[PDB]
Write a protein that binds this ligand. Structure first.
Ligand SMILES: Nc1ncnc2c1ncn2[C@@H]1O[C@H](COP(=O)(O)OP(=O)(O)OP(=O)(O)O)[C@@H](O)[C@H]1O
Ligand SMILES: Nc1ncnc2c1ncn2[C@@H]1O[C@H](COP(=O)(O)OP(=O)(O)OP(=O)(O)O)[C@@H](O)[C@H]1O
Ligand SMILES: [Mg+2]
Ligand SMILES: [Mg+2]
Lengths: 42, 259, 32, 217, 217, 255, 32, 30
């Protein structure tokens, strides 16, 4: 409950786990997208 | 039995809410009508002196709806700042019962006034709908998110000002009048599409302008948004301000209970 | 943009955790 | 059971920090009513504020395994622009009380103070000694074990003293008193032990007369 | 000498105007110290406000030909965030005293009020006893003939009471004493007659004990 | 003593007390009030300098702004400081010689002296930089300034008396000082205002007084139609009479 | 303009004398 | 322009030190 969220649970559920999953996705899974640019007018 | 601190906090918050309810909208309910007819008093003169100007600036958007979509959020922000500031000094004598912490006064003030402003927003939307104007937002979820971000930003700024200025009584006026220029630089009165471009970047430093533009963009269809206006900047501003205000209250927590 | 996104997310997570911790500390202090 | 463990309390003066209380390891007695005698410029009012949990010690701790009432004082403690009635509702709402006993407490506070229509008037309209009756009634409405009294009954009539004595006798055998005042017959008739503060140090006299004589000279 | 002329006093309340005094005619005896006593919330402070020129009666007047001091009491008469020294300086400048006499009065107040560094601090950070000491010294530093002490001595130590008694005996030949208090020993030891106010009328007891008994019962 | 001597001594003591709080413990306020007008002028040199040169090229912004800023600042200071009186000396009303009118009078003298010093310093430093600084018609400028002084003191006394029952209505009055700074023509010349908007603005006496002061200061400065001294003079006289009479009414309520 | 300039100088001199008298009184009272 | 960048680096370092000191005092007082 309210008087159960120790510093270990707060750090793990708000800092550690999201960073771990996001960095795993970014470094391992995410595919890179090249961008080609042009500048025109009529 | 032990009365766990959440119960004590909620009881103190309810008691403070009931206490400042009398002081906010008058002792005889003479202030509720004032805050009811204040927005219509604003829009009457605003359209009276700017109807043709807004018609030439942009069609397809009625001026009363454009003014309503920017007034009440700004009323929320301004009143949040003011009441959050005055809450700590309003109940100096009440800090004598071991449970009325200074943060509880500002929390109760915010929880009362956001409810009051939501009520008057609902009444204003109903009135606009009764006159045949457009009143239903196209994307209400994003509008609610922007409104929540603005509300929490205003509460954060009010708490920071309350914890800082408390030692300097004459500083309140310095930020009591500073809200009035924000009423003319946030784009609430007039659309920002007519502003000169060279003043655009410096004017974009105001997060309230970004929040107002984002809220308006979620209310009407095909509403264009200025380049460089985003939600990430107000979100970061508000989050950093809330963190800093909470830390500053934590540092000077005992000083505020000097009575 | 991997590393900039990771750094921004790290700062945001740290700020959120600090805000939550300060809020719970403020809540906890109400005693008799 | 109330004990003090290395209290230090100071204030932010322009000329450094004025240490009102240095390191104190005093242990209060038990099952007695204490008279805090002290003198002008001492730390009696600060001690009664600290004992009531009003402000935290700067560099100490006040361990208390007992319920201690808030300091009644002689100034403050009440909300401005409010009647005594709504002040009593606020106080009883802080403690989380049911409506029936809330109204009973309001009735008890109203009947303790010999105040007429002024009870439904703001505290500014009150006299300097009527608010003392209101505060004493509000403090005695609730159930505690150590009532902190800070010169509150110094501005009351003989009827007020008689009423306070009668109600305290009605509360005898279950609660105690910590009274600080400069009226020595009040301390003689109300307190069993004496705690004298001097240069920030608290000393206990088990006899009223010895501490009172140290106070005179 | 101070005489009343059918003066009535009232305050603005939503329920009406409560009459603290209604057509009051009274004549204070001369060459004696007057004990002004009464039940809580019954005159004795509006009376001393009118005696000191604080406010004017709505319908009536107070006629005197004798200088009257300001009504020193438990509050008021001083400005917060202001050093007690410069408050005394402002009071001296109000009466148009010369620079040397102003310095002499400041020194007399400082030596009377046995306060150290706190004498050079704002009056808001003062305990009740030291504020009372400063107020009593300021009142005694001026050459008046009647002094209006509004129970400001209830928060003073034995040292303050002894010093006040000595400083009043120093100039007891010509000056006089109008004192309101709820404690009885000081009234007996200072006053020679008694003035009791009950509802809206004042009554004179040439015997101190008779008036004390009437007020108590 | 004579009542005049008592009033003079009370006013002197109140002025001495008020100077320390208005200025500061270390007199840091002189580092602010002297910096008070400059901070306003500089930003307007970066905003409408070229716009003003297009509007009127005869005069220059560094002098046009000063000729209307410090008089407006002094009017605003009079109104604000006189409105905050009585309360700030509420504890001092305990000596039978300190009356509520004396506090506002002493604050008036203090504000007038401070703003006159600021005006003298500003004119000196404007003449130091080579700008036109000597007034053309000094007597007319002094008369218009005195009329503005009387109007400001009257409004301050009236608001101080009338806000005793309702303190909150005081605060909005301070807020109401902000729009006047934008509508009195201080920042920008009022000749650029569209014709259908001027008659509503003609009801503001501060605009007339500022225009007349600028006309008396600069050589060949034109005055718009409907701008006169009779209307501000009558407004100031009527307001002063009403404020004094209302203070006479509530003479004992404040004390 | 002889009389005009004389009147202007009169007003300026009176104002300057009043302000400097106030300053001198404050200095003399503060300097003890 | 090395001497111009030196002042900016000094300002940045001072601000970082102030923020770090404030947060570490916050942690210490916890
Ligand atoms: N708010 C404050 N800020 C700073 N210093 C204070 C403050 N209140 C009190 N003090 C200082 O601490 C001292 C503590 O005095 P306190 O108010 O406890 O009264 P006391 O000496 O115990 O009793 P009495 O009422 O008889 O004078 C004061 O004399 C003053 O020097
Ligand atoms: N400002 C005021 N507004 C309204 N009523 C007031 C005001 N001041 C005093 N009264 C009332 O006037 C009456 C006279 O009481 P007063 O204020 O003179 O105190 P008192 O009798 O000296 O008090 P005590 O003896 O308890 O010290 C009381 O009923 C009081 O409530
Ligand atoms: Mg005390
Ligand atoms: Mg009284």
């Amino acid at each position: 409950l309210v008087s159960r969220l120790t510093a270990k649970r707060l750090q793990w559920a708000l800092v550690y786990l999201p960073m771990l999953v996001a960095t795993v996705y970014f470094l391992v899974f995410s595919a890179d997208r090249y961008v080609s640019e042009s500048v025109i007018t009529v | 039995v032990k009365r766990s601190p959440w119960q004590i906090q909620q009881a103190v918050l309810f008691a403070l809410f009931l206490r400042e309810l009398k002081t906010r909208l008058g002792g005889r309910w003479l202030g509720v009508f004032w805050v009811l007819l204040e927005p219509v008093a604003h829009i009457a003169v605003m359209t009276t002196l700017f109807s043709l100007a807004h018609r030439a600036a942009m069609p397809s958007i009625e001026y009363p709806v454009f003014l309503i979509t920017g007034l009440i959020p700004f009323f929320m922000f301004r009143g949040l700042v003011t009441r959050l500031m005055e809450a700590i000094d309003s109940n100096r004598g009440l800090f004598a019962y071991r449970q009325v912490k200074p943060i509880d006064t500002v929390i109760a003030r915010a929880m009362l006034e956001i409810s009051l402003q939501s009520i008057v927003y609902l009444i204003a939307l109903g009135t606009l709908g009764w006159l045949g104007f457009h009143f239903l937002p196209v994307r209400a979820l994003e509008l609610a998110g922007v409104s929540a971000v603005l509300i929490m930003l205003g509460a954060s700024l009010g708490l920071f000002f309350a914890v800082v200025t408390n030692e300097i009584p004459q500083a309140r006026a310095i930020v009591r009048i500073s809200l009035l220029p924000l009423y003319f630089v946030s784009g609430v009165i007039f659309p920002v599409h007519t502003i000169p471009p060279q003043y655009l970047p410096l004017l974009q430093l105001n997060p309230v302008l970004h929040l107002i533009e984002l809220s308006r963009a979620s209310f009407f269809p095909q509403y264009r948004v200025l380049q460089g206006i985003n939600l990430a900047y107000p979100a970061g501003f508000a989050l950093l301000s809330l963190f800093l205000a909470l830390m500053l209250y934590r540092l000077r927590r005992h000083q505020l209970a000097s009575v | 943009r991997r590393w900039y996104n990771l750094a921004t997310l790290l700062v945001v997570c740290c700020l959120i955790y600090g805000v939550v911790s300060l809020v719970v500390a403020t809540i906890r202090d109400h005693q008799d | 059971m109330i004990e003090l463990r290395n209290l230090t309390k100071w204030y932010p003066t322009p000329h450094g920090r004025r240490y009102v209380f240095r390191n104190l390891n005093f242990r209060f007695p038990d099952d007695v009513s204490i008279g805090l005698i002290g003198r002008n410029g001492a730390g009696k009012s600060t001690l009664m504020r600290l004992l009531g949990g009003i402000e935290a010690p700067n560099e100490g701790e006040v361990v208390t395994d007992v319920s201690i009432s808030w300091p009644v004082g002689l100034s403050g403690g009440f909300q401005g622009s409010l009647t005594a009635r709504e002040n009593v509702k606020f106080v009883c709402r802080i403690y989380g009380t049911s409506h029936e006993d809330m109204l009973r407490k309001v009735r008890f506070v109203e009947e303790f103070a010999e105040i007429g229509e002024h009870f439904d008037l703001p505290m500014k309209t009150y006299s300097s000694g009527m608010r003392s009756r209101v505060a004493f009634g509000l403090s005695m409405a609730f159930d505690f074990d150590y009532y902190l009294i800070d010169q509150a009954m110094a501005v009351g009539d003989a009827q007020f003293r008689a009423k306070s004595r009668a109600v305290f006798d009605s509360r005898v055998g279950q609660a105690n008193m910590i009274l600080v005042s400069h009226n020595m017959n009040d301390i003689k008739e109300y307190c069993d032990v004496v705690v004298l503060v001097d240069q920030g140090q608290a000393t206990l006299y088990e006899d009223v007369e010895a501490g009172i004589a140290a106070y005179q000279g």
